[PDB]
Design a protein around this ligand. Sequence first.
Ligand SMILES: COCCCNc1ncnc2[nH]cnc12
Length: 208
Amino acid sequence: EVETFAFQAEIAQLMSLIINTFYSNKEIFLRELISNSSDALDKIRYESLTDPSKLDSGKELHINLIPNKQDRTLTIVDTGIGMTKADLINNLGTIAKSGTKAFMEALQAGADISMIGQFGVGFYSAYLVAEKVTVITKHNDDEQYAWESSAGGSFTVRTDTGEPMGRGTKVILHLKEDQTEYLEERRIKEIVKKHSQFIGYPITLFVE
Ligand SMILES: COCCCNc1ncnc2[nH]cnc12
């Protein structure tokens, strides 16, 4: 049923830096997530250029932003390439170990947390605002899985039996009590317009 895994030491360490460092400019989190989705959408676009049957699981390539005031969640959905069980376990497709290193050293030499994306670990920026992150994903070559973590040193991976998604990734941010601003329409609009205004995929903000 539910398998539990430990983060590689470097990622436990990244995640603790993101949760504990005093940093007010939390909003970059959305930019990094949206940008992860665009990369996933590139990836499925490219694959499909030579094998059009990869798009059998969904031809539309888009990103949705879904706030929910009652569950206290913001969810970023894309119909990108999605992840296999193995990529999920292996730091969600990232070079997280060396990325954390190159990040760490950028911070020694002048950088700030907003540069996180440049080291291929932007995903973890979700912990700027989320206390728990759930990631549901479906790649063509595999089943649908959910990855989960309230940080703390460990993640879980189960096969997901709820709503079949087709193909792609859903990053559910279970928001911290004091960051409910990121559920506001106006606030999300502001951030998309500020940081993600030239992303090559439609981005729909859902209403409640
Ligand atoms: C490179 O990002 C690392 C974590 C997220 N990686 C991802 N992989 C596949 N589809 C996605 N959709 C959004 N993020 C995705």
